[PDB]
Design a protein around this ligand. Structure first.
Ligand SMILES: Nc1nc2c(ncn2[C@@H]2O[C@H](COP(=O)(O)OP(=O)(O)O)[C@@H](O)[C@H]2O)c(=O)[nH]1
Lengths: 344, 339, 54
């Protein structure tokens, strides 16, 4: 009672000061939660924020993706070849059959990225083949990686002995993470906090409320999934599952005061796909013209329509190509502004 | 062929466990208690309020000394409080604020936490060099860390959203044992008194018994109509209580291998976030979604009262080893000590 | 297939072949333990309100 035990009370006071200052710093930062199905682009937007608003990637960090690049590469070629079996597609040149076997021989189990002169040639022979190409064109009929062609077309560069992933290579890589991914950056005078709970494959129900009160959500959508299914339910359309998700997220009680920002991503892939495939596949009752403008607009209207508090909340749609830094740079800037004009 | 022996063998194996239980069901905990003098209704008042967390608090844990306690809030800080002087002994800067759990080591030497980062961070409170930085990051889980409990400075168990619990060697940061078995996110785990074994509540609406040394599931308890977020051992170690989304708390007996009682009441439909027993085990304390902590007669199954003093939900409970006081954590960022 | 089934069977065996007890014994025992320490519990017994801890 009243003496030297007061030495701790001043430390207690010191601690509070730190809490205070920090808590103040914590009250003027922008928190963005990325959401949306797998493969929608969340991860890329995250990496974009690091190339645009922060250090980008140093030769050091870059060489540390060299394996994933090779892995993705191999993973991609294998999936296509396998895809030829299910689709009953031949090789343009029969000698490829041997290469296919060697692909699997060399490409051992999941160690890491191998990349040898022998394996490089093999993959190059396969990718170049007309049947493989014929199959690649039907990537809508099976699960296929989006950066397949990206890496495969650049096999010569990638395969090089002294190769080093470029920031693009890094951006195009898709690594499966299970923990929450987070990134910070300062931009336009404010500090930012962006998180991706993509790989957090668990019961959403348990942790969702942890984000109640985020500044805003950026919900990504893969426009090109309109003609894709789910290799598990078969009948379930991917574009539909995303909408269900959106409906859930959009009208979610925890997000009642949060700004919603749809990123209708993969517009570049959609632009090419819509020529070939009718939106009618995804939306049977679609009587519009099968053109980018009308089709893209239809989809936009479908998701925004899900919003039930239409008079209470506003959906800030933006069309993107997450792999384009310039495009991401610009859109984010419009996002940032809407954000301040809307809130702060 | 041979696949049938196994299948058939399995099918019947369940029945016997079932029937065996049915067999032992000669009476009810309630009937045999019906005559006891009821606790009546005793009251509690807040003796302390710990202020210092900004965000919601998701977990707290009393130190074996019954005075100090940790608390994890998603404000990125573990604050180690002095429940007596209310002094902040520590504020640990988390490398990831998505903390869902915190544990205080029996020796008051360490403290642990983790969450959406899927890691169990061990903090050595004795950094003679000065203050604290992470000592060990126990990584292996592929789902959020829902709970963790040190056995002793050398070992700690963790439950995870990836449906498993595990035993780790702190000294080396390696994973000792993988307790597979639950088919749903493991929300809570409870260390038996002798730290010999533990139980875990999950989203598959089942609790389980595990042999720490043997690393396998002994018994499996069912009955909850929804997820289980809290699990707690009856002081003697031959029973335990579980908290659930189905708005109920339940007492299960180990030796009898089944549920003895359900603690429910109409006009109470929110989920339970935390459970705890009084020093004697007569009272069962459950932290509720509706900002309150409800107190029940662990033997009689009625409401002995309720602790109201929170503005957001009660997310975590805590009874001192000396049974002297109760602690409550809340989404409202405050912690209270009740007597 | 076989490897999984066997893994299950052996687990079932583990829970099935255990030393069980009847409720009344189990129940009474708990009721017992409670009534046993009923005095050594500060949250039941409004202990010497003087200065102890809080
Ligand atoms: N062509 C193209 N590729 C994209 C686009 N957005 C992302 N990607 C790729 O499609 C795949 C999935 O993206 P990712 O960000 O990994 O999705 P997440 O699973 O939601 O994180 C990756 O190969 C990305 O590089 C886009 O707009 N166009």
């Amino acid at each position: 009672l009243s003496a030297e035990d007061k030495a701790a009370v001043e430390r207690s006071k010191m601690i509070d000061r730190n809490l205070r200052e920090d808590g103040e710093k914590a009250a003027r930062e922008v928190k963005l939660l990325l959401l949306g199905a797998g493969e929608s682009g969340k991860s890329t937007i995250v990496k974009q924020m690091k190339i645009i608003h922060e250090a980008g990637y140093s030769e050091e960090e870059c060489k540390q993706y060299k394996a994933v690049v090779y892995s993705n590469t191999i993973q991609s070629i294998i999936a296509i070849i396998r895809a030829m079996g299910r689709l009953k597609i031949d090789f343009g040149d029969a000698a490829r059959a041997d290469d296919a076997r060697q692909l699997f021989v060399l490409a051992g189990a999941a160690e890491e990225g191998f990349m040898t002169a022998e394996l490089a040639g093999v993959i190059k022979r396969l990718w170049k083949d007309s049947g493989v190409q014929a199959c690649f064109n039907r990537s809508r009929e099976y699960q296929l990686n989006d950066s397949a062609a990206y890496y495969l077309n650049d096999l010569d560069r990638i395969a090089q002995p002294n190769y080093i992933p470029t920031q693009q290579d890094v951006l195009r890589t898709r690594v499966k993470t299970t923990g929450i991914v987070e990134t910070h950056f300062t931009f336009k005078d404010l500090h930012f906090k962006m998180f991706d709970v993509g790989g957090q494959r668990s019961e959403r129900k348990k942790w969702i409320h942890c984000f109640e009160g985020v500044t805003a959500i950026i919900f990504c959508v893969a426009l090109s999934d309109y003609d894709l299914v789910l290799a598990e339910d078969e009948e379930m359309n991917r574009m539909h599952e995303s909408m269900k998700l959106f409906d859930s997220i959009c009208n979610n009680k925890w997000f009642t005061d949060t700004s919603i920002i749809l990123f209708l991503n993969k517009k570049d892939l959609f632009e090419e796909k819509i020529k070939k495939s009718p939106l009618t596949i995804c939306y049977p009752e679609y009587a519009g013209s099968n053109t980018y403008e009308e089709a893209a607009a239809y989809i936009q209207c479908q998701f925004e329509d899900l919003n039930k508090r239409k008079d209470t909340k506003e959906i800030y749609t933006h069309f993107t190509c997450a792999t384009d830094t310039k495009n991401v740079q610009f859109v984010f800037d419009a996002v940032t502004d809407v954000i301040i004009k809307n809130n702060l | 062929s041979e696949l049938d022996q196994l299948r058939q063998e399995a099918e019947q194996l369940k029945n016997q466990i079932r029937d065996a239980r049915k067999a032992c069901a000669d009476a009810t905990l309630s009937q045999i208690t019906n005559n006891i003098d009821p606790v009546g209704r005793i009251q509690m008042r807040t003796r302390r309020t710990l202020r210092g967390h900004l965000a919601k608090i998701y977990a707290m844990h009393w130190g074996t000394d019954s005075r100090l306690l940790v608390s994890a809030s998603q404000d990125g800080k573990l604050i180690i409080w002095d429940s007596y002087t209310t002094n902040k002994v520590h504020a640990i800067p988390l490398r990831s604020s998505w903390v869902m759990t915190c544990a205080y080591a029996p020796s008051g030497n360490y403290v642990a936490c983790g969450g959406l980062d899927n890691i169990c961070s061990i903090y050595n409170l004795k950094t003679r060099e000065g203050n604290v930085r992470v000592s060990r990051e126990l990584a292996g889980h592929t789902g959020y860390l829902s709970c963790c409990r040190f056995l002793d400075d050398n070992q700690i168990v963790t439950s995870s959203g990836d449906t498993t619990c595990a035993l780790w060697d702190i000294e080396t940061g390696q994973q000792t044992t993988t307790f597979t078995g639950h088919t749903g996110d493991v929300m809570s785990l409870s260390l038996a008194p002798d730290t010999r074994l533990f139980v875990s509540g999950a989203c598959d609406a089942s609790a389980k018994l595990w042999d720490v040394r043997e690393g396998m599931c002994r018994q499996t308890f069912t009955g909850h109509e929804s997820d289980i977020n809290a699990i707690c051992f009856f002081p003697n170690g031959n029973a335990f209580a579980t908290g659930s989304d189905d708005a109920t708390c339940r007492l299960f007996d180990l030796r009898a291998d089944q549920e003895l009682m359900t603690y429910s009441h109409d006009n109470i439909i929110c989920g339970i976030t935390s459970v705890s027993f009084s020093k004697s085990g007569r009272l069962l304390l459950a932290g509720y979604d509706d900002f309150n902590c409800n107190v029940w007669d662990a033997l009689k199954a009625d409401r002995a009262g309720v602790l109201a003093g929170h503005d957001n939900r009660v997310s975590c409970l805590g009874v001192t080893d000396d049974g002297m006081a109760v602690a409550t954590g809340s989404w409202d960022s405050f912690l209270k000590i009740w007597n | 297939s076989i490897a999984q089934a066997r893994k299950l069977v052996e687990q079932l065996k583990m829970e099935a072949n255990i030393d069980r007890i009847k409720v009344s014994k189990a129940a009474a025992d708990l009721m017992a333990y409670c009534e046993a320490h009923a005095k050594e519990d500060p949250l039941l017994t409004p202990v010497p309100a003087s200065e102890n801890p809080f």
